[PDB]
């Protein structure tokens, strides 16, 4: 029988507008993550968060261990950047594709780098965005569709590395054989046509998918860094 993860691919692209690529991604065994950094040291924040997350998960690759790795990542980034004249930090969305005996796949997320599931040709967002716009969506006041270009979607309400305490969302992922997961930074949906994003995301080869997703985002203007992780499940 099949493993829970069949294959995965990642891509990151600075795009033609931003002066730095402050996004980072991770694909490490059953652990996958995207971190979207912000601020003068946003690159430092996202890279340090993922380095720390990877190390912590390796030392304790279970649900509690993943949560304590996210706490560790928060503290490490805060210790390194918290002293700076301006605020820098990062989002973090991590997925651990645990087998059923370890509770099944788990998402831990902070900020606005979403997790999507692609099932039967549909792509749906599984996570809450911790932004001003994300709160409006939660309450039913705007659609997700609406929210992608809301003037306040860039105002984060949770981030890693900006203080000593964080409360990420933590939930199991309802997924199974044939499903695909996509973790992305917000840059993917900054401007491109949703149908075109789904077309790219559904490309049979995950390595083609991630390249097409970066191309779609850049063709549409590439206003932000775009980073994607595609995971095919078994």
Binding residues for Mg(2+): 36-37, 112, 186, 224
Using the minimum distance from each CB to Cl ion, give the nearer residue, 19 or 64.
19
| Binding residue for Cl ion, selected from 6, 7, 18, 196, defined by CB under 5 A | 18
Nearest-5° angle of CA 71, CA 73, CA 75?
70
Q: What are phi and psi of 172, to 5 degrees?
A: -75, 155
CA angle 218, 47, 164 (to 5 degrees): 120
Phi-psi domain of 86 (left: phi exceeds 0; alpha: psi -120 through 50; beta: other) = beta
- Locate all alpha helices (DSSP H) within the chain, ordered by sequence: 42-59, 63-81, 132-138, 144-147, 194-201, 206-219
State which of residues 13, 36, 129, 232 lies at the interface with Mg ion (CB under 5 A).
Answer: 36
Nearest CB to Mg ion, comparing residues 5 and 160:
160
Q: How far is the CB of 153 from Mg ion (least distance, A)?
A: 10
Task: Name the one range near Mg ion by CB under 5 A: 76-84, 93-101, 150-158, 218-226.
Answer: 218-226
86 scored as a contact of Cl ion (CB under 5 A): no
Structure token pair of residue 58: 């390796």
Nearer to Mg ion, 5 or 41 (CB): 41
Partner touching 19 among Cl ion, Mg ion, none, CB below 5 to 8 Å by kind:
Cl ion
Token look-up 């900006």 returns 162
186 scored as a contact of Mg ion (CB under 5 A): yes
Phi-psi region of 111 (alpha: psi -120 to 50; beta: other; left: phi over 0): left
Asked whether position 22 contacts Mg ion by CB under 5 A, the answer is: yes
13 near Mg ion, rule: CB under 5 A: no
| Closer Cβ to Mg ion, 18 or 211, answer by number | 18
Find the shortest distance in angstroms from Cβ 17 to Cl ion: 8
Minimum CB separation of residue 169 from Cl ion in Å reads 26
DSSP per-residue string spanning 165-188: ----EEEE----TT-EEEEE-GGG
Count other C-beta atoms under 10 Å from residue 163's C-beta. 13
Scanning 20-28, 61-69, 121-129, 149-157 for contacts with Cl ion by CB under 5 A, the matching segment is 20-28
* Binding interface with Cl ion (CB under 5 A): 18-20
């Amino acid at each position: 029988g099949m493993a829970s993860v069949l294959s995965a691919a990642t891509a990151t692209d600075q795009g033609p507008v931003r002066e730095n690529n402050q996004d980072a991604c991770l694909a490490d065994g059953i652990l996958y993550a995207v971190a979207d950094g912000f601020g003068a040291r946003g690159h430092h924040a996202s890279a340090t968060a993922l380095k720390t997350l990877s190390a912590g998960f390796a030392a304790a690759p279970d649900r509690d261990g993943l949560l304590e790795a996210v706490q560790q990542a928060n503290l490490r980034v805060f210790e390194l950047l918290g002293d700076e004249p301006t605020v820098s930090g990062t989002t973090l969305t991590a997925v651990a594709v645990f087998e059923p005996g370890q509770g099944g796949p788990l998402v831990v997320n902070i900020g606005d780098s979403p997790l999507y599931r692609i099932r039967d040709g549909h792509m749906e967002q599984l996570t809450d965005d911790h932004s001003v716009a994300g709160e409006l969506v939660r309450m039913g006041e705007i659609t997700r569709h609406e929210a992608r270009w809301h003037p306040q979607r860039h105002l984060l309400t949770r981030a890693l590395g900006i203080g000593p305490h964080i409360g990420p969302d933590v939930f199991g992922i309802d997924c199974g054989p044939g499903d695909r997961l996509l973790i992305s930074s917000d840059g993917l949906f900054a401007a491109a046509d949703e149908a075109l994003i789904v077309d790219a995301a559904t490309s049979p080869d995950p390595q083609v998918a991630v390249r097409r997703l970066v191309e779609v985002a850049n063709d549409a203007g590439g206003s932000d860094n775009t980073t994607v992780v595609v995971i095919d499940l078994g």
